[PDB]
Design an enzyme around this catalytic site. Structure first.
Site, PDB file in Angstrom:
ATOM      1  N   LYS A 294     -13.126   3.491   0.130  1.00 48.32           N
ATOM      2  CA  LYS A 294     -12.937   3.600   1.571  1.00 48.32           C
ATOM      3  C   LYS A 294     -14.155   4.243   2.221  1.00 48.32           C
ATOM      4  CE  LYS A 294      -8.895   5.281   2.771  1.00 48.32           C
ATOM      5  NZ  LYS A 294      -7.724   6.235   2.740  1.00 48.32           N
TER       6      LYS A 294
ATOM      7  N   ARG B 261      -5.295  19.507   7.733  1.00 41.75           N
ATOM      8  CA  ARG B 261      -4.113  19.370   8.581  1.00 41.75           C
ATOM      9  C   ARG B 261      -3.679  20.682   9.215  1.00 41.75           C
ATOM     10  NH1 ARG B 261      -1.642  14.271   8.824  1.00 41.75           N
ATOM     11  NH2 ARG B 261      -2.439  12.834   7.225  1.00 41.75           N
TER      12      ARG B 261
ATOM     13  N   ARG C 253       0.828  -1.202   0.000  1.00 41.45           N
ATOM     14  CA  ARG C 253       0.000   0.000   0.000  1.00 41.45           C
ATOM     15  C   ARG C 253       0.869   1.263   0.000  1.00 41.45           C
ATOM     16  NH1 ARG C 253      -1.774   3.053   4.834  1.00 41.45           N
ATOM     17  NH2 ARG C 253      -3.274   4.618   4.105  1.00 41.45           N
TER      18      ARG C 253
ATOM     19  N   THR D 232      -6.721  -0.526   9.827  1.00 41.40           N
ATOM     20  CA  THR D 232      -6.352   0.476  10.786  1.00 41.40           C
ATOM     21  C   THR D 232      -6.233   0.000  12.214  1.00 41.40           C
ATOM     22  OG1 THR D 232      -7.051   2.283   9.289  1.00 41.40           O
ATOM     23  CG2 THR D 232      -6.449   2.838  11.445  1.00 41.40           C
TER      24      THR D 232
HETATM   25 MN   LIG Z   1      -8.856   7.796   6.483  1.00 38.64          MN
END
Ligand SMILES: [Mn+2]
Ligand SMILES: O=P(O)(O)OC[C@H]1O[C@](O)(COP(=O)(O)O)[C@@H](O)[C@@H]1O
Ligand SMILES: O=P(O)(O)OC[C@H]1O[C@](O)(COP(=O)(O)O)[C@@H](O)[C@@H]1O
Ligand SMILES: O=P(O)(O)OC[C@H]1O[C@](O)(COP(=O)(O)O)[C@@H](O)[C@@H]1O
Lengths: 522, 505, 460, 500
Positions: A261, A115, A70, A319
């Site tokens: 996702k 961010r 990945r 995750t």
């Molecule tokens: Mn994410």
């Protein structure tokens, strides 16, 4: 009984629990002394980073069980990722055709990331203290213990007084006290060590970010240019989000698999329309467990894995599965439990991030996931799962679908060591895997890319066939079937005496699978 | 259907009606809010982070049901203080009989512990010696060459190369940074007594201090359980013994251990060093299954929200682990360092509460009840017959609760073993039974404090009414709800034999 | 297992080994001809009255052999004829301790829209003849059916006669639709409001409109004879199984009727097909099975009754309760009705301990009926003061009515207890109950029907 | 899924039901059967069904197996019956595509005990005597079982158990005719006569033996020996007719090719009300073992004199199919009654309806579970083929078979799809009639030079015969089951094909 295989045989692979009449009795019969036999079937995705970039390290990881690499496009330039791709490919190639292990390469998009900025290296946000969240470009690098800058200008409009702002995996928490010209004035609910450029989540907020950013588009085209096999599309919320991705990939990227996702409330609620146009799903638990309450994530995960299983499409669990292994040599009891339960839930793939990207034990983390998945797969109650999948799947007049269920049924009848299938696109292998046979699905293909992509499907072992065609097609078929057998013998899948099921088609070209044969290995 | 359109969208009811487990999973809904009270009990370990009366009050409010005393550390004086503090915190709520929460106290034994910052280099050679190093002499006898020594929660490993009078000479298999007084595991024939001298004094202490439960460490066989019961003596006959299964022998000899125990703890910490870490989930799921089948409490333990020792929120695997322990069928879930020593002890309890509540609603009762009902044996015992009848009835009408009068807790445990969705509200005069029933999922103990009525039938009715009144106050019950009331035909325990369907007015 | 201390011999009886099998196929494989039935026969037997069974002495032998419901076929005979039949049944029934009294119901079977010695090589608005034997294609051979009227005047007169003589049940011929059932209810009038209406399904339209018919009926008869002429004979079993299934789901009595032991009209012993047909009707889920010619005109009326009893008892033991209970349970809707909730709790409880009986107090029969529908193995012993409800509950499989004759005690709780004891003493005498048995007792919280809400576990 | 009309037929709405109870509730009289009738029909040869002309009508009505009852008639009589059956059967051989193989079964006399004035036995009041000078009155009963005196001392049944005795007193009286059947419930093997009848059977090429009163495995080995080396290919169906046969069922089934529930005698040897228990049990265990089972005796009894059966008789036929019987049988109804052809047509009509009402969902799941793992490729291919047929609603499973075995292994899973079995063995074609849902096609052409071509040619024969007979139509899916080399025992291939 059958002493043809041995008393020992029926004590292995949780077989005593396999024959239980109820799920509860199946649980009661699980046995820590019953050793796994089948090859580990759940795909392992490992995230590339400083700890796993080296060609030598990648070879160790492939040896340990990594099936998919990945690339996290949240960080690093294009040149950085080009080098990552380069090293993976060299590791993969620098190992006999019979032992070759394809490794897929997946591009994980940045998506709508918010961010914070670069401080004036580490600061602390004292609990109770007041912090100003600013979008004033003056404070871009002026971040400190009382002043946080973020790269999302409209933030000052989407977070109402009282709203919460999460920073760094939702660890740091801020509640908005006063909104003003300078920005949101907030009080540190949960403090901690804020670093530079940390992730921000606005759970309740109505965020107005594009969905597919200009950067994402460039990254995707980069992916097409470098021949990535899979794209993990960030923050998919609806069918049209996947269309955008497909469009950005263009004519040349039509063969790339799109895994959507699911990372927020809308994506969970519009799951059905998303799964319908996607090749598969990632349960992206990191963002999901901030965007919705942490205690509801398992419900989303179990629901999504279930619907993917029904639909016969790959689902990834992601995750923090072995998080503690970033710094420790052994995982916690919760982490081993989480990997095992992801497999038992029905996941096709499990994933590692920090554990392989930046941690101190990247190879050990891959090995641990391999060991757990293998135990877990043997503990699957096939009797109930097969019957429930069978009864839910719809009647089909597609000969590939008909042959697949016949093949898997036949496999269960004789304890087949493998189902060997010829496939051009992966599809015939995919329709076999969806019934979750105990038998390994050994897929023989000439398509190097299909060989990589099929790693998305539990229990499929791709073999890349390299020889030019025989003059006589039936001869070419037979030779590939033999390639599958000899590969399987070499790799420990098959022994003289084993029964295999063999799945082929009646004419060349994709879509004509229609034959199952029962063969003894000699 | 009837009298509720919004009612049937909540508590994962759409998933509850699914015809298969796969369809059930497919119907789970993040927007379907839990309604029932959280039913899995929460065990918190007492330590510096959770020992003060003020902190214990917050933990009781957060949902702690059982306070665990870890006798691997601390003096008797230290533990006496812990107990006094828990009791002070608990009785601080006693002013409200209707809203008061009994909290159990469990003594977790030290057991056969072996103990030992410098770094152990891999490949190098370390010298294990009992010459005044490990606190267990016979170690130099129970380990054959090429046998393995784990140190420090199994993080460090060693294999024996030379057996000499200077000690055991070993090379480092897995290296790491050592420390002092660190736990040693030997996965083989330890002679260490089933029950040490210290253990015997600790159990005597527990009895003298009125502890409700013992968690017995490293139970390997039925005779270890009998030794604990002997150690507790006549004064401690009423104390529940929960056997901790922590090594390979315990897992193998599980049935005989279970038969003579009141319940079981899956002690995943030691278990995960004693057997390969990747097999623990198999042992966990099997032991929980067998406990459910036998109708005996089972506890899931160790490292469930580990990162909350230092972080305000748990990892994704930790929340998953808690939810799955509930789905597995655990009666209790546990917190150790997370409450004993961490920075977020109250947040840890609140997170377990929130997760358990969601997980409980996701239980596929249709299959679980059918399987528990079937696998369970015919019984001519009226309390058992009544219990299954009552649980069937509650399911039929989606009862808000089953109200049961119990002296010993037993009539309540027998209801619990079938996993009703309805809350089991247990009215008792026994303070200790009220505490001990916390070992059973979905039992909500109400301590009844009023002296007996002259007419026994009136006294029963008062207690049923007490059940109803507390139920309303606590949000278990509302007007128009149906409840099942389970009682007996005469006073004294063991005579339960009646269930009634009542409308709440 | 543990309960083996109740006997090793005990668990080899009443098809218990087959009972615990995990699949239906395995259940069949374990049926055992040497496993003897234990429970009292539960499926009700309906015997048609005729010249072979008018005798008070003969009717007494029939009641003793197992007859629970006497059927009057108003297709033949004058009102005076039927009044005499009624008279004889009542005298047989009464001329028998209150602890052994067997109530017998009387059902009036309407004539309906009837249409009526050469060798073929009354409906003006005018083709099968004689039990569909001759047609029509064309099956010349030695009562007429027209597969391609309503509540007659005669029917109305008969129904009024029915009310005058206090019949308990009406079997309404050729019911095709809901409004047909309303017409019957009308003809019965205010004075006939307590009479149970069983709708006879006998043609295609009745099969197709089954649901609306069952909704307004107290129950259903599968009237094989006309049915097997009105639709192809080879389809009847489909109709029968469907109707019995849906009545089971609905918890309303269903009766299987017609040629069940036909050969016994002239022979002492039935054919293999006949014994099979009776056992399969019970296995299908019928509440009642019926005899016509076999008892009305045949030479072995008492033997026919005895044969249905013997077969029914073996077949009830062979029911796969595990699957049936589960399927009924999963199919029936959630319920806030305390009687419904109590009933399922009592049957679950009975199954848990192999109860000898469930003893239930009932005014109208309802409480007993809602127990009946879950098909417990335990006998449902229903104690009632209503003589009419005591007869009518014979329509429900597994209900044994006891008629309680004493005036009420001063204290209601005492009166309740006395009746429960009456049930226990009756059950002891009749052999339902033995010292050491467990029974489930179902009662209510206030007097009057509709308040059943209590279940208790009691040992004898 | 093409047509909402398609899914209304063959009880498909009930087929999809989630429980057995709901399946029953969905059964529909308006839902017409589509599939070919799959339960086999056995007709007994007698004066009513012996002529070549009658047998032709019987074959057309659906008779699959002709039963020869050796309790009556001479060898010459039975040789004529056999020749007549064969003439009738071969009258149709001119059409290889639509020709129907008919099996011939020899039903042995067995250990029968027998006793036209027709006297009357009055209840309460009889001398059971073996004195060989009696040819019997209202108090005199003579039996051809000399040892009766020693063995009984105790109820004695006569005349289909209609009359009973307990020197004895009458317990159940009645009119007694000439030479009536005698039963002795609660305690000779194979007759010297039985042995000659069996030798006769082999010499006349019968396909099946129904062996009377089989009590234990050794009784079956005795039949096998009597058949000898020339009779090795003949199927043995053991008749279970008494208490001991039922209790030793398992050991009997192990060594038999199949079973007959002989309800006539069984219903006298054990209480009449228990026979259904024996029947359902035996059918279940045979279904489980994958061996044919026959339901026999009185299924349509009233049709001996009546044109139409009673309601109980139709129910009996349908329930026997629903129970799992591979074959159903007619005796007096075809041997001596007035409506032999109508009897055959009625069983055909009922069987067809019942087959559609089978709840395959549960049946297939249960047979599959209860069945043992196998490493036999024929067994593995069969379940895969049957699973595949269910997945696509295949019209047929076409199987090549030498001995019938590959077809039998398909049959044991009760597919809805017809099992069309193409074979060169005439006898195998007759013998597969014992298996529910196998339709034998006798292939008559000489072998191709190239074996693969010969295989293909036979599959095509399968398809063409199927279309002519109405099993198959353009657009249907079929599963084809074949093997990897010539000779029996090598089946290992299943293929999904479209019918063009
Ligand atoms: Mn994410
Ligand atoms: O899985 P896919 O993509 O449908 O491919 C399966 C195909 O492979 C084959 O077995 C062989 O195809 P090729 O010879 O063209 O590689 C075909 O018979 C079949 O249609
Ligand atoms: O669950 P236990 O411990 O057996 O107690 C149940 C007992 O409680 C009662 O309901 C009431 O008992 P007390 O009044 O003596 O407290 C009894 O009827 C019954 O036997
Ligand atoms: O069912 P059986 O008796 O085993 O016969 C099946 C046989 O028929 C075949 O399909 C063809 O065999 P033949 O060509 O010899 O007739 C074989 O491949 C297979 O072994």
């Amino acid at each position: 009984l059958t002493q043809e295989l041995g008393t020992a045989f029926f004590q292995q692979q949780q077989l005593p629990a396999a024959m239980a009449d109820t799920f509860l009795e199946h649980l009661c019969l699980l046995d820590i002394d019953s050793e796994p036999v089948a090859a580990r079937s759940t795909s392992i995705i490992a995230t590339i980073g400083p700890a796993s970039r080296s060609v030598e390290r990648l070879k160790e990881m492939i040896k340990a069980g990594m099936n998919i690499a990945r690339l996290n496009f949240s960080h690093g330039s294009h040149e950085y990722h080009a080098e990552s791709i380069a090293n993976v490919r060299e590791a993969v190639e620098s190992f006999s055709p019979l032992s070759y292990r394809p490794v897929a390469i997946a591009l994980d998009t940045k998506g709508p990331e918010i961010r914070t900025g670069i401080l004036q290296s580490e600061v602390e946000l004292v609990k109770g203290s007041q912090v100003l969240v600013t979008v004033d470009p003056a404070f871009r690098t002026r971040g400190n213990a009382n002043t946080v800058w973020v790269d999302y200008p409209n933030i000052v409009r989407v977070v109402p007084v009282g709203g919460r702002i999460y920073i760094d995996d939702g660890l740091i928490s801020l509640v908005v006290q006063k909104i003003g010209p300078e920005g949101l004035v907030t009080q540190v609910e949960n403090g901690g060590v804020l670093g530079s450029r940390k992730g921000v989540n606005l759970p309740g907020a109505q965020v107005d970010l594009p969905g597919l950013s200009e950067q994402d588009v460039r990254d995707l085209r980069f992916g097409v240019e470098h021949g990535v096999d899979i794209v993990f599309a960030s923050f998919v919320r609806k069918a049209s989000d996947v269309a955008a991705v497909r469009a950005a990939l263009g004519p040349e990227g039509h063969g790339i698999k799109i895994i959507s996702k699911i990372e927020n409330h809308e994506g969970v609620k519009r799951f059905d329309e998303i799964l319908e146009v996607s090749d598969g799903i990632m349960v992206a638990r990191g963002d999901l467990g901030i965007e919705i309450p942490a205690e509801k994530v398992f419900l989303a995960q179990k629901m999504m894995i279930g619907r993917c299983n029904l639909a016969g499409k790959p689902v990834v669990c992601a995750t923090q599965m072995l998080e503690s292994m970033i710094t420790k040599a052994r995982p916690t009891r919760a982490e081993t439990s989480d990997v095992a339960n992801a497999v038992l839930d029905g996941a096709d793939c499990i994933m590692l991030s920090g554990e392989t990207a930046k941690g101190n034990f990247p190879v050990e983390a891959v090995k641990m996931q391999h060991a757990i998945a293998r135990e877990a797969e043997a503990a699957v109650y096939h009797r109930q799962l097969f019957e429930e999948l069978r009864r839910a799947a719809p009647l089909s007049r597609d000969p590939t679908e008909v042959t697949a269920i016949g093949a898997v049924e036949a496999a269960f009848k004789c304890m087949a060591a493998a189902i060997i299938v010829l496939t051009t696109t992966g599809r015939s292998a995919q329709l076999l895997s969806r019934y979750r046979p105990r038998a390994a699905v050994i897929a023989v293909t000439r398509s190097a890319q299909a060989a990589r992509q099929v790693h998305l499907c539990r229990g499929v072992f791709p073999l890349l066939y390299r020889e030019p065609p025989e003059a006589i097609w039936a001869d070419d078929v037979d030779r590939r079937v033999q390639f599958g057998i000899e590969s399987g013998k070499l790799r420990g899948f098959l022994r003289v005496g084993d029964l295999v099921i063999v799945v082929t088609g009646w004419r060349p070209g994709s879509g004509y699978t229609n034959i199952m044969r029962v063969l003894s290995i000699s």
